[PDB]
Amino acid sequence: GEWFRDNGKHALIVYDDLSKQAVAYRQLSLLLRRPPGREAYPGDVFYLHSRLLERAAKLSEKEGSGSLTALPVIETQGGDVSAYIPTNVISITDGQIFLEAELFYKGIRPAINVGLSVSRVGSAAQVKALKQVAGSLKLFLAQYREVAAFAQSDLDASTKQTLVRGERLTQLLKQNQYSPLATEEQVPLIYAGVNGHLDGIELSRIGEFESSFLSYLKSNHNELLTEIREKGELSKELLASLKSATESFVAT
Amino acid sequence: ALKQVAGSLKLFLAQYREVAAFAQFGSDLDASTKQTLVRGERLTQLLKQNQYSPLATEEQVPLIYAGVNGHLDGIELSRIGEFESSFLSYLKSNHNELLTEIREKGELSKELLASLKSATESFVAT
Amino acid sequence: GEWFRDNGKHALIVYDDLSKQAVAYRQLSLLLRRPPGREAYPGDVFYLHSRLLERAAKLSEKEGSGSLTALPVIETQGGDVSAYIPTNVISITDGQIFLEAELFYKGIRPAINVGLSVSRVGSAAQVK
Amino acid sequence: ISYAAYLNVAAQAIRSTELQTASVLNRSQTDAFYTQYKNASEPTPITK
Amino acid sequence: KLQFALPHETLYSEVTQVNLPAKSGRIGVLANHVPTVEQLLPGVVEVMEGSNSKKFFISGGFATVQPDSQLCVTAIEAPLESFSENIKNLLAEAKKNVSSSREAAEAAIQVEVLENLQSV
Amino acid sequence: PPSFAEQSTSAEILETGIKVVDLLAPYARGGKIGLFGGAGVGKTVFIQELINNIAKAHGGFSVFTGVGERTREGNDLYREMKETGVINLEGESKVALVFGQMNEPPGARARVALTGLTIAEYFRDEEGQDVLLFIDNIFRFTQAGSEVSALLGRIPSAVGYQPTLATDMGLLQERITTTKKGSVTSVQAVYVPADDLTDPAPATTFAHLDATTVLSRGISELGIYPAVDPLDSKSRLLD
Amino acid sequence: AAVVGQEHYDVASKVQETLQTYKSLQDIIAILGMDELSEQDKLTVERARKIQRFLSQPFAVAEVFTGIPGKLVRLKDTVASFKAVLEGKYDNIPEHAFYMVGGIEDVVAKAEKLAA
Amino acid sequence: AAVVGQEHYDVASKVQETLQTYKSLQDIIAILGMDELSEQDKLTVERARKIQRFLSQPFAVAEVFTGIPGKLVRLKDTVASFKAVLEGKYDNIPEHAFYMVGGIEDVVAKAEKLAA
Amino acid sequence: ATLKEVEMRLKSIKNIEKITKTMKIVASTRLSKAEKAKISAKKMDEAEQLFYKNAETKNKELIVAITSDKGLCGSIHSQLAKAVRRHLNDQPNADIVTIGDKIKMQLLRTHPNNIKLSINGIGKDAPTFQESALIADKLLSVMKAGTYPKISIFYNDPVSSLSFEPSEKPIFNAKTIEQSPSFGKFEIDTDANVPRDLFEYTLANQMLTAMAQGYAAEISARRNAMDNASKNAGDMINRYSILYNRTRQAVITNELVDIITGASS
């Protein structure tokens, strides 16, 4: 991957997985009779993974601006992020995407636990278009997770609302396997959600909404899609155009 | 003979464990829940046994039988202990032929079950 | 401390603290490769404190009546007195003064938890 | 049928869509039952 | 001094005049009225504060004028045309079908207060 | 470490010029301060203002030591120090950077703190300054020591740490103190394993701390900068 | 869906969602009981309890343990059977009728035998 | 029973039953408290709290810590005392009267003092 | 004492605490909706009852006892059964109507034979005139309430949020209204049975009033029970978190020790 990085290009590397790599290093270390420590790992198993992962980098202009991006995989045991190897890798990387079985069975796929996932880089690494709608998405979900339990007859105005958005925003994030979406397809969906245009639509129909809304936009508003893709930002004019296109489709 | 009478005793005692776990919610109960809670509570009691006091198969059969089919269901819980010895004393005096059939054949023909049915009902009221 | 004790006088000795002593002894023991036991202390960590604290004594009239009083300090973790080092020392000394974090935070200071504190032999010596 | 049962019906007609909020549709709804008791066993449950 | 109270909402608990739909016919109650106790039929109630009139449609209940001259009105359901045809007739026509097929008795009575509300 | 007889006999306050700190949880001169809080709390800006304030108020320099620092974040920290003025290539800088990257072997990550510390000590002894020493992260100095110890064949102590856990910590911490010439004051980022404050690493570290500065998302969400929690932040010298 | 078909895949997902909702709500049941649940939640719990039981099956080899003759059920009957349940076609049928049987015809048959 | 007699064994058994019932309820009590118990349980626990206090005893050697003269109670006295408590003959007596005394007499005597 | 034993014991309590904490807040919401039903019923209680204070109306017996079906509401049902029983010593032959399953149990245990009617499924929503009436309806039909010389309603009276109070209130029959010391201070038309209706209507109104008063008292008792539940549970959590971190530590040590003993040979 470094060949790409070193030559002004950009590579992505997936290590699937680093758990099993540790286990191979531990086999050699024990059979060469090197001293064992926690879980019988050798005292340089941290160094093993940090040597590997700091090789992912974004080079300066002087050095060609090439890039290497790493998606290492770690398998936990019963959700235990405190085990030795997960501890190591977690503290080396720039953030975690955390998957959970409970969410998976719920329908939530990909099964990303949003409260526990982070990207230490954050906004800097986001298409401005998506950032303009994602900013408030993070909030509405945070507020939704606090009030989650209240989901069972006597609930006031504000908390009933947080429940209505939350459920639908959660539902928008469901996505079929092998079906990645362009940014210009992503923003109208999150725009619609975040702004309330989904609240009237029943929870089971959000999936069919996404499909129809995208093709309606490709049929009738392809100019807006094209501006999102090409400019990567949203003028106040775009915002209002989106607002109109969304309001238009919701009623139909 | 022991198998015949202890049909689903294990599954039933499991049904009883479930039902008792629930009622601990202090809620009122229906015929079904109150009946099994009654039967299971007596069946548990029936199986308590002193040390050094092993019983013969022909002694075990009629006890389990009286439990499982429900002949104990209308007897106070504290009295199940004394019922055991008295039922056996009654069976050893009057229905001693019944016991012998159980010990020597080790099985219960349709006729034996009927004989045992009536022998229990007779004792349930003094 | 013992000099005063042996010469008809009285010394008080504060060991601040035995928790850190026992951490130091565990360092030698592990470096010497003595087998680690509970919480990786060596089998003889009780003895380390017991032989030390037994030297605090009230001597007879024949031995000059001197005395050495000991106030050892032990640090708990999360107010847990059931732990190895804490209980070893409880089973050596003649009572404990337990200081509770919850009392200390409220502003009750000294933060003595009265139900968990005891003087095993001190009543006979209390000013009337 | 009693005087307050009669008044009830006259208050439930004058009930039975935008002025008819939730606590109105609810004031017209009861999941209540009555079981008769003697000697105590019961004469089986009936809707109020 | 008037006490007008419904189970779910208290309405009024100084007035110049109150009109109630009593046992047979409408009644007016001024600042001094001799203590009476009267049923209230399913009809209209009008409170006065000077020349200010505020009419209500009501389920029924009871009026009492106490010694201290205070009037006491209570009813279950309590504005006239402002709150109460299509809402009404869909249910009320469907009452005639219930009089033939217990349920017969109550359904029969629905007609007197439905037809009385339509007469205002 | 400076001799027993060389030690200052009275605790005294190091004035930071930051209101919350000076009033509610004042730093000890020649003491150690636990800095708590991760990203998105203006931690680096907080560090950079202490660098600035100590230099303008007390005429003292700073040394920032990244122990097991992410290379990505050293590059960010350096680029940000130049933008902020605490480092000036063309002019005069106020801080020295010493970095022991995560990808260096355990022996390097265990000694970097001492490297940073020695530069800080020189300003105290030779130039009689009140110096700041920043260690981010002190937990990472502990783990490096665990790793070195393991590699040397020493039998690990409780929870897998090195048997010399406390003396390793003391040989570093005892050097940060006030002498007759001046003082080194250390602000140390502290990671808590498993959020277990009874874990050997934080428990040993905490024995040397004199104050804590707690940076919190709850304070910044309210729009309060610096995002210092006024209740959580505690100082032994508030007396 | 590419392998078993879309219909099969959907029943599977929804069976699993019903089951997980039930696992989720078990802590509200244990402490506050069934009365506190929502209208749509009560219905999900009642369908889940049926589904749990319906998933049980008498094996031919397990006959000595049960005394129940073993049952083997075709994949297509399994899908059709569980689909019907999720659509609410057998809501009036009590729990025990779904326990330790074959396909849906068996459920119907046990239900009538228990009532008589 | 062959060593101590049926009565002693029976009493010991029933003391143990009572206490076990109380032990099995610790969790519910600590979270929810006495109000959530059934009526049987509330009685059993109230009795268990007494038996537990009644098992305390002033020791002659511990006189300095208890503040009270030490008591030696005879086996036969102990059996009859506990027998009676189990029979609900002292249910109206406050818990504190059972604490740190000899046999049932001491209990009765302490209950009288506190009524003042 | 195993790690596994501890982790599942701690998640169990963590949920209990989250549940009661939601329940306490659902309660506060449910209580404010109940203070509006309670103020609107106690005002109608002084409008309706002012008549009787003036006509000075004064009194086999019918006891109507009011709680609910729901528990986890402190000692609502227990100390009301106390009030009923204490009253039932001074007249044991009384007939009993229970409104709500919990009070039916309490009383079925201690006076099983006095109970003749039980009303059911009241716990959930607020009380309403429709139920009061339909209940009042059966009292007249099945229980023949008309013939009783005395009718007592027993119910719980919300003194504050922190405290309620078990109370009794009488229902006067047709005969008793007529014969009241000062019935003649009023100019009643003696045409068609007016004291009959002024009783059947009071049966319903006064029941409603008591139910609404018992409700508000119950909801305040459940709010405070759920409050102590949450607090007690949140205490356990702390103690169990600490036990958890000890055990997590000890597992790492003990596992290391075996690894080390195996590496010494």
For chain E, list the domains and their CATH numbers.
1-84 (2.60.15.10), 85-120 (no CATH)
* Strand duo D33-36 + C118-119: pairing: unpaired
Domain containing residue D3: CATH number:
1.10.1620.20
- Interchain touch A–E (≥3 Cβ pairs closer than 8 Å): no
- The whole-angstrom separation of Cα F153 and Cα F158 is 16
Question: What whole-number distance in Å separates Cα of residue D6 and Cα of residue D27?
Answer: 16
What are the CA-CA distances from residue C110 to residues C106, C113, C117, F229, F238 (Å)? 11, 9, 12, 27, 18
- Which residue in the set I246, I256, I260 is minimally distant from C80, CB to CB? I246
Residue F163 forms contact with I (CB below 8 Å):
no
Which I-chain residues 6-45 have CB contacts (< 8 A) with chain H?
A: 13, 16
Using the structure block, give the residue that is written with the tokens 């509405």: A140
B71: Cβ contacts below 8 Å, ≥ 6 apart: B65, B120, B121, B124
Distances (CA, A) of D28 to D17, I134, I207: 14, 12, 17
CA distance linking residue D42 with residue E17, whole number of Å: 54
Give the separation between CA E94 and CA C47, rounded to whole angstroms.
96
To 5 degrees, how large is the angle CA H56–CA H62–CA H65?
90
| DSSP state at residue F98 | E
Chains in touch with H (3+ beta-carbon pairs under 8 Å) read B, I
User: Whole-angstrom Cα distance, residue E74 to residue I208?
Assistant: 14
Burial class (CB in 10 A: 0-12, 13-18, 19+), C89: buried
| Beta bridge mates, I156 | I166
How many of the other CB atoms lie within 10 Å of CB of G69?
9
Report the run of H or E that residue A238 belongs to, with start and end: helix A236-251
CA–CA dist I96, I119 (Å, integer): 11
Give how far D16 is from chain I: nearest CA, Å. Answer: 14
Q: With respect to CATH, is domain I1-25+226-265 assigned 3.40.50.720? A: no
Do I and G make contact, counting contact as 3+ CB pairs within 8 angstroms? yes
CA nearest neighbour of G12 among G56, G71, G75: G75
Nearest CA to I102 out of D45, H39, H25, D38 is that of: H39
C-alpha separations of A231 from A181, A224, A241 in Å: 17, 10, 15
Name residue B102's amino acid.
I
* Kind and range of the H or E run holding E11: none
Closest among I54, I132, I58 to E64, alpha carbons compared: I54
Known binder of ligand: residue F17? no
| I246 interfaces chain C, CB cutoff of 8 Å | yes
Residues of B within 8 A of I104 (CB-CB) are: 28
Residues F15, I113: Cα–Cα separation, whole Å:
82
Residue E95 region by backbone torsions, left for phi larger than 0, else alpha for psi between -120 and 50, else beta: alpha
Let me know if domain A127-252 sits in CATH 1.10.3720.10: no
Breaks (C-N over 2.5 A) in chain B follow: none
Residue F12 known to be catalytic: no
CATH class of I26-225: alpha beta
Please give the residue range of the domain that contains residue D33: 1-48
Per the structure, the count of domains in chain B is 1
d(CA G32, CA B25): 8
Strand spans (E) along E1-120: 2-5, 17-21, 26-29, 37-40, 44-49, 52-57, 61-65, 71-75
Q: Burial letters for F123-157: b for 16+ Cβ neighbours within 10 Å, e otherwise?
A: bbeeeebbbbbbbbbbbbbbbbbbbbbbbeebbbb
**A41: Cβ contacts below 8 Å, ≥ 6 apart:** A22, A26, A29, A84, A85
Looking from the CA of F216 toward its CB, the CA atoms found within 13 Å total: 13
Tell me the residue type at I172. Answer: F
| Residues carrying CATH 3.40.1380.10, chain I | 26-225
Whether residues G27 and I72 touch (CB distance < 8 A) is answered with: no
Whether residue F66 is annotated as binding a ligand: the answer is no
Helical axes B57-68 vs B96-105, angle rounded to 10° = 110
State the method: X-ray
* Contact of F32 with F11, CB cutoff 8 Å: no
CA distance linking residue F87 with residue F65, whole number of Å: 15
Residues facing E65 on adjacent strands: E71
Residues in chain G with CB shorter than 8 Å from the CB of A177 are none
Cα(H98)–Cα(H52) distance, rounded to whole angstroms? 9
CB contact under 8 A, C78 and F155: no
- Could you tell me the maximum CA-CA distance found in chain D, to the nearest angstrom? 51
Binding residue per annotation — F39? yes
CB pairs under 8 A between A and F: 53
Shortest CA distance from C40: residue in chain I: I253
Asked if residue E76 lies in contact with residue D11, where contact means CB atoms within 8 angstroms, the answer is yes
Query: SS3 string of C45-107?
Result: HHHHHHHHHCCCCECCCCCCCCEEEEEECCCCCCCCCCCHHHHHHHCCCCEECCECHHHHHHC
- Asked about F70 being catalytic, the answer comes back as yes
Interface chains of chain E (3 or more CB pairs under 8 Å): D, I
Burial (CB count <10 Å: 0-12, 13-18, 19+), residue I2? exposed
Q: Is G27 on the interface with I (CB under 8 A)?
A: yes
Check A33, A34, A55, A120 and give the catalytic one: A120
DSSP letters spanning D18-48:
-SS-HHHHHTT----EEEE-B--B----EE-
H33 class by beta-carbon count within 10 Å (0-12 exposed, 13-18 middle, 19+ buried): middle
**What is residue A8's three-state secondary structure?**
coil
Let me know how long chain I is: 265
Q: What gap in Å lies between CA I83 and CA D11, rounded to an integer?
A: 35
Question: Do chain H and chain I touch with ≥3 beta carbon pairs under 8 Å?
Answer: yes
For residue H2, report the phi and psi dihedrals to the nearest 5 degrees.
Answer: -65, -20
Residues of I in contact with D28 (CB under 8 A): 130
Cβ of residue I141 closer than 8 Å to a chain E Cβ:
no
E69 CB-near residues (< 8 Å, 6+ apart): E1, E31, E32, E33
The full length of chain E comes to 120
- How is residue E69 written in tokens? 């001259």
The span from the CA of I92 to the CA of I110, in Å, is 11
Specify the 3-state DSSP secondary structure of E70. coil
As a 3-state breakdown, chain F gives helix, strand, coil percent values, each rounded to 5, of 40, 15, 40
Domains of chain F and any CATH numbers: 1-237 (3.40.50.300)
Q: How many CB atoms lie within 10 A of CB I182?
A: 13
Structure token pair of residue B33: 């829940």
Q: Are strands E44-49 and D46-47 parallel, antiparallel or unpaired?
A: unpaired
Contacts 24+ apart (CB under 8 A), A91-100: A91/F191, A92/A46, A92/A49, A92/A50, A92/A53, A92/A54, A92/F70, A92/F102, A93/A53, A94/A119, A94/A120, A94/A121, A94/F70, A94/F72, A95/A119, A95/A120, A95/A121
Contact call for residues F100 and F69 (beta carbons, < 8 A): yes
- Helix A206-220 × helix A183-195 angle, to 10°: 120
Q: Which residue of I has its CA nearest to F194?
A: I245
CA distances from H96 to H99, H107, H114 (A): 5, 9, 9
Q: Is F69 a catalytic residue?
A: yes
| Closest partner CB to H32 (pick from I75, I106, I229) | I229
- At I231, which amino acid appears? K
Return the CATH fold of H1-116. 1.10.1140
- Residue H80 CB-density burial (10 A; 0-12 exposed, 13-18 middle, 19+ buried): middle
Q: Where in chain I is the domain with CATH 1.10.287.80?
A: 1-25+226-265
- Say which residues have a Cβ less than 8 Å from residue F198's Cβ, sequence separation at least 6: C77, C78, I242, I245, I246, I249
